[PDB]
Write a protein that binds this ligand. Structure first.
Ligand SMILES: CC(C)C[C@H](N)C(=O)O
Ligand code: NA
Ligand code: NA
Length: 488
């Protein structure tokens, strides 16, 4: 079984797992929609009551499974809970990452194509009224992905977009087929410093922005001024816990698969804490200080919130490049932004496609080459439904990327800390750690986190069926594979 070569390499690979498109695309939108600073206070709390404990739990479950040669949740749930329903629940740990990747890699291909076109300078040229500049870029995006012009929910991606998607899939395959250390870790050691440097440069350049409508400091103040009145609103807590799940890759089965290659005796407490802290630094500091500060600097706080309500794609692929186009060297700055997004999306897509590869390797005894190639074939085939059927991405992100991840985090917490045991799980978490988990977190993992998640869950066109029917089929397919494994 493969193992990580260096501890720093493991930290950077886990950071690349956590640091992705969400940090720079969803967190600005979710923070601006929930009142700026009024969203930051619960988010941090959700990081302390939900994020870190589930991170440690997934690390421990991954290492525990990998010690016995099982990297995926169908087998790890059965190890922690000897029951067929445990395998059925673990099938979600393969279904969620695959379905998520099916469109995540397409968005990553978007970022790659935009980076290419901005480096070559094949960008729209607006004339010297905000709509006068936003419309050329908007249409620029609409021609790339093929937004429907009429009532039919049919997408028509450009040939360049399809070729760039092929290239993105090829890059993911070239990274994954080389293995854990020689592929994921080696690429992480290069991509993470690049990501941080690009994010820091963009943060500085955006902080240097100022128009008669405001400054980037105004956006930073809007994002960092606490509003204790909105602590009463449950929707802020819903958004905060959901964003924590999305940014820390919790409930996607990826952290478990990555930790399954950590050796039996290696540390998981300090390592996972450092990885989560790096991701939080990148998203909260760097990711949050690019889009929203520039939007506030060019339009003010109210118009920036109104633009953020339009969606993550509209802010990341239309509004920010249009804003950059009004500054000296703005095309190159947009190229830097899209290259940052592409490296983030790549370091996340390899991580969310690794679970299926690990399942095929451990449970069906497929070689790494065959496993990577078959996973790539499945993802590339299924991605056409997202590429051509409108709102299929929305359905996949709702069922697998939103409901599925939260329910799966709750399920893994219940299986590890209630079914498998509380003292056993705690000792497995703290075994071999450079530092020890604070004792209070025990009562956070056993009582506070599941009750929090349950309370928040409780308080929380026909073509959609086309997507649903498909992804359900995928689940069945995966189940059949599990069945075959059990018969082998
Ligand atoms: C699906 C996950 C890889 C997403 C990742 N946590 C991100 O920030 O984009
Ligand atoms: Na993240
Ligand atoms: Na990443």
């Amino acid at each position: 079984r493969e193992h990580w070569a260096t501890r720093l390499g493991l930290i950077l690979a886990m950071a690349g797992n956590a640091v992705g498109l969400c940090n720079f695309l969803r967190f600005p939108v979710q923070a601006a929609e929930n009142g700026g600073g009024a969203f930051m206070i619960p988010y941090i709390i959700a990081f302390l009551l939900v994020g870190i404990p589930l991170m440690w739990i997934e690390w421990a479950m991954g290492r525990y499974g990998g010690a016995q040669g099982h990297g995926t949740t169908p087998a790890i749930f059965y190890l922690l809970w000897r029951n067929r329903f445990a395998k059925i629940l673990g099938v979600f740990g393969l279904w969620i990452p695959l379905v998520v990747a099916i469109y995540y890699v397409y968005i990553e291909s978007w970022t790659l194509g935009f980076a290419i076109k901005f480096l070559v300078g094949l960008v729209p040229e607006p004339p010297p009224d905000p709509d006068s500049i936003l419309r050329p870029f908007k249409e620029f995006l609409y021609s790339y992905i093929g937004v429907p012009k009429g009532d039919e929910p049919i997408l028509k991606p450009s040939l360049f977009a399809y070729i760039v998607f092929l290239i993105t899939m090829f890059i993911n395959v070239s990274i994954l087929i080389r293995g854990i250390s020689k592929g994921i870790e080696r690429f992480a050691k290069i991509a993470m410093p690049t990501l941080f440097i690009l994010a820091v440069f963009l943060v500085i350049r955006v902080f240097l922005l100022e128009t008669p409508n405001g400054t980037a400091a105004d956006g930073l103040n809007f994002l960092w001024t606490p509003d204790f009145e909105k602590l009463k609103d449950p929707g802020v807590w819903i958004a905060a816990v959901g964003q924590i799940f999305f940014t820390l890759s919790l409930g996607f089965g990826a952290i478990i698969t990555y930790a399954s290659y950590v050796r039996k005796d290696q540390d998981i407490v300090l390592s996972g804490l450092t990885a989560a802290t790096l991701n939080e630094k990148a998203e909260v500091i760097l990711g949050g200080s690019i889009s929203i500060p520039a939007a506030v600097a060019f339009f003010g706080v109210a118009n920036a919130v109104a633009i953020a309500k339009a969606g993550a794609f509209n802010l990341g692929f239309i509004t920010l490049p249009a804003i950059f186009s009004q500054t000296a060297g703005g095309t190159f700055l947009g190229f830097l932004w899209f290259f940052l997004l592409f490296f983030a999306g790549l370091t996340s897509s390899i991580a969310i496609m690794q679970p299926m590869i690990a399942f095929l390797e451990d449970e069906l005894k497929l070689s790494r080459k065959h496993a990577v190639l078959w996973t790539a074939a499945i993802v590339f085939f299924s991605a056409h439904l997202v590429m051509f059927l409108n709102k299929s991405l929305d359905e996949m992100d709702f069922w697998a990327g939103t409901i599925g991840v939260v329910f799966f985090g709750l399920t893994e917490l219940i299986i590890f800390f209630w079914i498998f045991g509380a003292d056993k799980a705690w000792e497995e978490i703290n075994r071999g750690g450079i530092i020890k988990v604070p004792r209070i977190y025990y009562y956070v993992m056993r009582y506070i986190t599941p009750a929090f998640l349950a309370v928040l869950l409780v308080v929380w066109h026909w073509t959609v069926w086309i997507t649903r029917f498909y992804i359900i089929g995928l689940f069945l397919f995966l189940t059949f594979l599990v069945f075959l494994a059990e018969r082998r």
